[PDB]
Design a protein around this ligand. Structure first.
Ligand SMILES: [Mg+2]
Ligand SMILES: [Mg+2]
Ligand SMILES: [Mg+2]
Ligand SMILES: [Mg+2]
Ligand SMILES: [Mg+2]
Ligand SMILES: [Mg+2]
Ligand SMILES: [Mg+2]
Lengths: 89, 110, 34, 121, 44
RNA sequence: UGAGUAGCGAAAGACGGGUGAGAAUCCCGUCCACCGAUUGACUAAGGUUUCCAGAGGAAGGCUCGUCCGCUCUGGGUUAGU
RNA sequence: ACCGAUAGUGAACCAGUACCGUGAGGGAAAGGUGAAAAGCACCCCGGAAGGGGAGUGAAAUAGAACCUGAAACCGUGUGCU
């Protein structure tokens, strides 16, 4: 059970900046630590992953009239590695 | 021929506009752009875009000459308001009534 | 210190006889920019 | 004379000293009517010290003219005090007083205030 | 001046949480009037 | 209606230049001036995306407004101590 | 031989909702284009809003606050005084 842990990448100006140091970015499910994440990439991609950081977010507020609704919640995984690379697009 | 033009939901009171129009009625046309831009008010720059729409449609839609062409009907009439509130000394509050107007010009030959 | 009555439609309008504005001068349109 | 301009003594003595200076640099400014009928006088009493040019007038041509503005005209640097005694004084060596000129533009948009120009001649 | 309702979060839940309404029968007749009337927010 | 009346919340600003359909009130620059065991700099409660960058000017801002803690759009909180 | 949008239910629509209160608990407002979207291609004034012509339609003084459209209140014109 790997391909339900991590979902999709984040391509930004910071995520594009960090690929000059082989730091890549993903958007992880909740309910998951950083050790479940480390052996996930390391068995899809065969990259010999290195250390990992993580964070959370909080609801924002989309609203366009009669739709006073909140939004889902995130948990990013700024990942790092030395030996190798992965081309995503 | 009698051309016209109307401006709609213009954000000024009528009682403030109606002071300028009395200086504009029953007069020539080029004897009005002058008296308008030599009157320090805030009404004047919006009654000036509203002649020049009634003069630029007596040239392309209805084919009259601007040489002799006078002003026969100008008037302002009330509109919808916008209710607001200002707080006061004690917990009480007080009304505010921000008002609007519609403007209407008519240019005619004889 | 408080109005005892209502102000009619006439007495409101008999009063504004002088509550108008005035016209600029007229030099040849040119301004009177002395 | 005797105009106060809604500004107490300690304020008016510093508003009429900035007007006298920044004028001289650019020789043409844009003010309200009242103020320029009062630098009509302050600045006309300030070239009359520049024709003497003596060592004493420079000492009373500094108690109203304003702190040393390190100008920069064409490839240079001046002071407003070594421009007033060298250059304006020399243009104006053979006239009597009356070297200012007021000119009426229109009013302003916000506060409805008569606006005028003032220059040198 | 100084006014009432100097907030906090320990004390807005130690006195009006869920688990203080359940531990007390008169607080279960509180809940059981807010489910029947139909409100989207039971006491927390 | 009262009525274009009472009021517009303690306090030093002036000129020049630039962008704009449009400037006392926005951006850059000069001098002057005030608070100063505070109108400084850090942290907690509590508040909960108000933070940042391009855009925008119907409403809100006790005036104006090309500007904004306001309106659209996409993005920003990284721990063996 | 019941109501027909101030009525009937607190709620015909976003309703036990927004909003008020530490809390228990209290409480609203708000329906209708046309038979048919055929929802005004194009030209002109203006920075945009809005208006004038053209054109769809049986009628646009039925143009998205759109079925009808009283009264208070606010105005332009002039037959006698
Ligand atoms: Mg004049
Ligand atoms: Mg007055
Ligand atoms: Mg009175
Ligand atoms: Mg500055
Ligand atoms: Mg900001
Ligand atoms: Mg009805
Ligand atoms: Mg019908």
């Amino acid at each position: 059970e790997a391909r339900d842990i991590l979902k999709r990448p984040v391509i930004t100006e910071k995520s594009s900046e960090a690929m000059a140091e082989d730091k890549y970015t993903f958007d992880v499910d909740t309910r998951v630590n950083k050790t479940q994440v480390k052996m996930a990439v390391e068995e899809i991609f065969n990259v010999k992953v290195a250390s990992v950081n993580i964070m959370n977010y909080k609801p924002k507020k989309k609203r366009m009239g009669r739709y006073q609704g909140y939004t889902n919640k995130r948990r990013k995984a700024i990942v790092t590695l030395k030996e190798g690379s992965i081309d995503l697009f | 021929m009698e051309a016209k033009a109307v401006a709609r939901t213009i954000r000024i009171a009528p009682r403030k506009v109606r002071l300028v129009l009395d200086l504009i009625r029953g007069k020539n046309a080029a004897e009005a752009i002058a008296i308008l831009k030599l009157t320090n008010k805030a009404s004047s720059p919006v009654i000036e875009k509203v002649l020049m729409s009634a003069l630029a449609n007596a040239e392309h839609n209805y084919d009259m000459n601007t040489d002799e062409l006078v002003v026969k009907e100008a008037y302002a009439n009330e509109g919808p308001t916008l209710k607001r509130f200002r707080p006061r000394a004690q917990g009480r509050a007080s009304a505010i009534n921000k008002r609007t107007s519609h403007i209407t010009i008519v240019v005619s030959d004889g | 210190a408080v109005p005892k009555r209502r102000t009619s439609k006439t007495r409101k309008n008999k009063r504004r006889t002088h509550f108008k504005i005035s016209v600029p001068g007229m030099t040849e349109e040119y301004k009177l920019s002395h | 004379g005797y105009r106060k301009l809604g500004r107490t003594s300690d304020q008016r003595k510093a508003m009429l000293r900035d007007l006298a200076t920044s004028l001289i640099i650019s020789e043409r400014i844009e003010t309200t009517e009242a103020r320029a009928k009062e630098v009509r006088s302050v600045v006309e009493k300030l070239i009359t010290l520049g024709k003497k040019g003596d060592l004493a007038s420079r000492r009373n041509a500094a108690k109203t003219l304003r702190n040393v503005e390190i100008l920069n005209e064409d490839e240079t640097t001046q002071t407003a005090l070594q421009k007033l005694f060298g250059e304006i004084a020399e243009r104006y060596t053979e006239r009597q007083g009356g070297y200012t000129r007021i000119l009426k533009q229109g009013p302003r948009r916000g506060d409805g205030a008569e606006s005028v120009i003032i220059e040198l001649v | 001046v100084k006014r009432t309702y100097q907030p906090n979060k320990r004390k807005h839940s130690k006195v009006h949480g869920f688990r203080k309404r359940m531990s007390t029968k008169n607080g279960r007749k509180v809940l059981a009037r807010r489910r029947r009337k139909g409100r989207k927010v039971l006491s927390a």
